Amino acid sequence: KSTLSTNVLHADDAYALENDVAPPIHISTTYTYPGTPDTLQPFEEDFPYYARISGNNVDRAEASLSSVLGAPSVVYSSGLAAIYGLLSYLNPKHIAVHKPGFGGYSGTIQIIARINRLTGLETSFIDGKCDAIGEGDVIWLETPLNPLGIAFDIPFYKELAKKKGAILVVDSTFAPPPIQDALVLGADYVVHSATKYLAGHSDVLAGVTASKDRSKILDLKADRAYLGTILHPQQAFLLLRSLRTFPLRIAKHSENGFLVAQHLNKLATDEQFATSLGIDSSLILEVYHNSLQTKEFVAKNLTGGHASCFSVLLKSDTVAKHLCCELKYFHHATSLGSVESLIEWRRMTDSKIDPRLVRLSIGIEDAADLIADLNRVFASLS
Template sequence: MNEQHSAGRFETLAIHAGQEPDPLTGAVVPPIHQVSTFKQDGVGGLRGGYEYSRSANPTRTALEENLAALEGGSRGLAFASGLAAEDCLLRTVLRPGDHVVLPGDAYGGTFRLITKVVERWGVAWSVADTGDPASVRAALRPETKVVWVETPSNPLLGITDIALVAEITRSAGARLVVDNTFASPYLQQPLALGADVVVHSTTKYLGGHSDVIGGALVTADQGLADELAFHQNALGAVAGPFDSWLVLRGIKTLAVRMDRHSANAARIVETLSAHRAVSQVLYPGLPDHPGHETAAKQMRGFGGMVSFRVAGGEEAAVAVCDRARVFTLGESLGGVESLIEHPGRMTHASAAGSALEVPGDLVRLSVGIEAVDDLLEDLTRALG
């Protein structure tokens, strides 16, 4: 990265880190290197270290350098999906006989990957309330190698004190992995708080426009970064050039989008909290939300994800989802458009019947950047 942009505030790094103007044409946006292989100047004579796009591609390199800068890491790695990133990480740091601590409230895809795939390699897992230090300590075993945290969590918006859990994890000789998808690096930087690895679904807030699937890992541990890069190449689930370019384009506006997501969410929370059809609102910005003080300490803002429980039970919650119109019924999150979903039957169906099962009366919102009054009118109508 050019010395001019090697440091700076977040908004500047988002636009410039890893994205110097093209040296040949002066293009201010990195080109899409839609290519599988690169000409070599003699056997082993690589230009810029590029030989084959699974191993490295200039567009992906730009994204990876940008991600590392935003999270304050030494290296970023971009993948074909968030779960591909998680798979690479787990294959890198775990061996048969190892143990993983999962949060009691985790993304259903992560739960499925660990309990249906990783467990078959001989890796054990258990669940802890990562918002409670005593619960984390009780879950640790001599063979624990990874403590997995989501904060805010999906879909109950649970908050974990990253710095505190990092101390506990480090003393046990394990690695702390933080899924930072809900917060984005604009609102929270786990590496600075002691995490070993940050995970992202770049599909979500980083991409920001519901038009790309991707994932990322960022670490400040150069030795671990080298191991992850080896497995990234060996496993091959890398981000393609166009997908990398789309995520880079989204990141340029991340700061302004997150400000609007957060502002809209705060207004929606006010309305939901006063509505007779809502029995509980889950949002880190609420003073009575568990972990609110921790969130205020370690986050720049409270984000655009809101969950709430419907007073009439599961069928009433499903009906609210079905009646929404401006809020689109759909999975995923973090796009400019607002989404509504029923986690129990949609994103977290894989956790049904387990310790991670979510309440049937729960509705999850990904609050977009539309006119907030339109969103409020739509929700009020959907709630009846």
């Protein structure tokens, strides 16, 4: 009955151990045992007395996260910690991922290599078929895709996974609910880097996995106790603080992402519009964004908004470098999902990638200011 704005604020009320309005930071590693000599009662998976196994700050953060995700959730010290935990738990023989040249988070490929070192896990590529995938194998669908910001059809891959007896994991980092609900669309598990949108202020590393199957999430929590990857109390406090404003922030990100992507696409494709702004439309070759895909499934996947991190292919590496250095409201930096807008020249970190490609992460500024900034730089290059 209550909606997201209310639930992020009150989902943890039942988990409060004290009268503090803001959650306390239960920073202690260890907690004294209750009980007297007579009542002292010998009894570790829900052991609440050691913070590397379980803790109140994590409990409250997971309550709020589960309200966002609509399912039992397990929170980790980073997105890659969540991914490593999930893939080591599932222990598939085969995994299908997006081909690395096309896109997909490089850290996921590095985790697959580290698991392959141990298990021989074999990689194939997502191709609409996934012939190599069988029973207990994993389809790892990252959508929207890092760095392009375009979407894939989750229900389609759920039907493939179902036919094959395989497991569909969606890395939904670029579109958390309410923009996309990967679990409702059929994903067996969903993973997010909460470092990005959910925390949102570039000051928390965190990962989260969710599933409608609570017993699997409990297994993951048990494993987390020994992989050593629980989110610590101080970070769980800041993550929970962020979640309080997540419904407001994510709505603004989505609106801004649509507006900025659409403006850039209009510049690239409408020579009269560009000229009206003092801009040579040839500076932008292509804009990638979910709103520019012509496929009907995209609006059935991203039911509640738009990606705010997406890429642009520019005319040259010169244009890309000027754009990354000269914007007033976009800092040249990696990561995404921050309150402030960011831009990244993808070639910085990757020698194989086309030096014309830049990735934008739209923050919660006034879109008219972001568009005026972009216009100023593009005009200076015309």
